Design an enzyme around this catalytic site. Sequence first.
Site, PDB file in Angstrom:
ATOM      1  N   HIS A  93      35.277 -47.627  16.330  1.00  0.00           N
ATOM      2  CA  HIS A  93      36.527 -47.211  15.693  1.00  0.00           C
ATOM      3  C   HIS A  93      36.495 -47.437  14.154  1.00  0.00           C
ATOM      4  O   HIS A  93      37.391 -47.061  13.468  1.00  0.00           O
ATOM      5  CB  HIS A  93      37.770 -47.792  16.347  1.00  0.00           C
ATOM      6  CG  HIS A  93      38.026 -49.214  16.020  1.00  0.00           C
ATOM      7  ND1 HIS A  93      38.707 -49.610  14.894  1.00  0.00           N
ATOM      8  CD2 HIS A  93      37.732 -50.341  16.700  1.00  0.00           C
ATOM      9  CE1 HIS A  93      38.809 -50.924  14.889  1.00  0.00           C
ATOM     10  NE2 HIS A  93      38.213 -51.391  15.969  1.00  0.00           N
ATOM     11  N   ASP A 132      33.305 -49.619  22.451  1.00  0.00           N
ATOM     12  CA  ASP A 132      33.640 -49.663  21.028  1.00  0.00           C
ATOM     13  C   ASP A 132      32.592 -50.444  20.247  1.00  0.00           C
ATOM     14  O   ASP A 132      32.751 -51.581  19.920  1.00  0.00           O
ATOM     15  CB  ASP A 132      35.010 -50.255  20.860  1.00  0.00           C
ATOM     16  CG  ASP A 132      35.571 -50.114  19.464  1.00  0.00           C
ATOM     17  OD1 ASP A 132      35.028 -49.378  18.690  1.00  0.00           O
ATOM     18  OD2 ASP A 132      36.601 -50.748  19.224  1.00  0.00           O
ATOM     19  N   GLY A 159      41.948 -55.167  10.022  1.00  0.00           N
ATOM     20  CA  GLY A 159      40.948 -55.374   9.007  1.00  0.00           C
ATOM     21  C   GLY A 159      39.864 -56.346   9.412  1.00  0.00           C
ATOM     22  O   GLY A 159      38.878 -56.467   8.737  1.00  0.00           O
ATOM     23  N   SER A 216      38.636 -55.803  12.268  1.00  0.00           N
ATOM     24  CA  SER A 216      38.009 -54.873  13.156  1.00  0.00           C
ATOM     25  C   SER A 216      36.569 -54.703  12.806  1.00  0.00           C
ATOM     26  O   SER A 216      36.229 -54.618  11.707  1.00  0.00           O
ATOM     27  CB  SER A 216      38.558 -53.481  12.941  1.00  0.00           C
ATOM     28  OG  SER A 216      39.787 -53.333  13.410  1.00  0.00           O
ATOM     29  N   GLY A 217      35.758 -54.695  13.838  1.00  0.00           N
ATOM     30  CA  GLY A 217      34.347 -54.536  13.690  1.00  0.00           C
ATOM     31  C   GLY A 217      33.594 -55.824  13.495  1.00  0.00           C
ATOM     32  O   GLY A 217      32.444 -55.845  13.614  1.00  0.00           O
TER      33      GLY A 217
HETATM   34  C1  SZ4 Z   1      46.438 -54.290  16.082  1.00  0.00           C
HETATM   35  O1  SZ4 Z   1      45.329 -54.377  15.256  1.00  0.00           O
HETATM   36  C2  SZ4 Z   1      44.357 -55.204  15.614  1.00  0.00           C
HETATM   37  C3  SZ4 Z   1      43.113 -55.049  15.062  1.00  0.00           C
HETATM   38  C4  SZ4 Z   1      42.105 -55.884  15.455  1.00  0.00           C
HETATM   39  C5  SZ4 Z   1      42.364 -56.855  16.373  1.00  0.00           C
HETATM   40  C6  SZ4 Z   1      43.609 -57.021  16.897  1.00  0.00           C
HETATM   41  C7  SZ4 Z   1      43.853 -58.108  17.917  1.00  0.00           C
HETATM   42  N1  SZ4 Z   1      44.985 -58.897  17.623  1.00  0.00           N
HETATM   43  C8  SZ4 Z   1      44.620 -56.180  16.543  1.00  0.00           C
END
Ligand code: SZ4
Length: 223
Positions: A40, A84, A175, A177-178
């Site tokens: 993603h 993912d 943020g 993420s990844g």
């Molecule tokens: C909702 O946005 C997110 C992005 C990465 C990880 C998470 C987990 N709380 C939520």
Amino acid sequence: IVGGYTCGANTVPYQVSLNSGYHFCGGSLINSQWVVSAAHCYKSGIQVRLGEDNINVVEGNEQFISASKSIVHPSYNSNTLNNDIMLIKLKSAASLNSRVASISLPTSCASAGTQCLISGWGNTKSSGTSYPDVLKCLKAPILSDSSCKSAYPGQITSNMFCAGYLEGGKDSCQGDSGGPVVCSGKLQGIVSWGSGCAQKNKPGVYTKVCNYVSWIKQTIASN
Ligand SMILES: COc1cccc(CN)c1
Ligand SMILES: [Ca+2]
């Protein structure tokens, strides 16, 4: 990272920042030329930034290397977030040192109750928005598959695990993420999804890296 701590500069040497004019995701360096991230997180024009602490200041330990290719998992479903995971190849090999270092892939999958370190530059508020400049860290346990499935009925596949705290207050966030979830020196997870951040009964959900080791190795060997 909500409810975490300041890691300390360069204390998480495999942690990388993916930059497309601004930080948008994390990643993990798994050898001198490759990064593992979330599917993603895919976009064009990625520059990998290694050796980062404060992502807004040049502090002297950085290496900035553009991506030459990105490979999203063949089976990634953006709707369900199943599979993912993505690999990113660097245009040039990073120079490895104490502050820029690769993280080993798992030889075994980590169990529920294992303690792991989750890191990133993501939002630090469960309700507001505040983005930290320096890297934030969280120590969190892997949760049982049953508790994870209970938390998110209908949504947890065999390629996902939950980690964190059912009580809330400590979690990954936007943020992050990844980025990495590392347990006992191995990359067991990738920050993938959740419902908000740090909410009760909505722990973070992580890509289950051990399921992908063969794909990662094979992909690297041919690209
Ligand atoms: C909702 O946005 C997110 C992005 C990465 C990880 C998470 C987990 N709380 C939520
Ligand atoms: Ca910096």
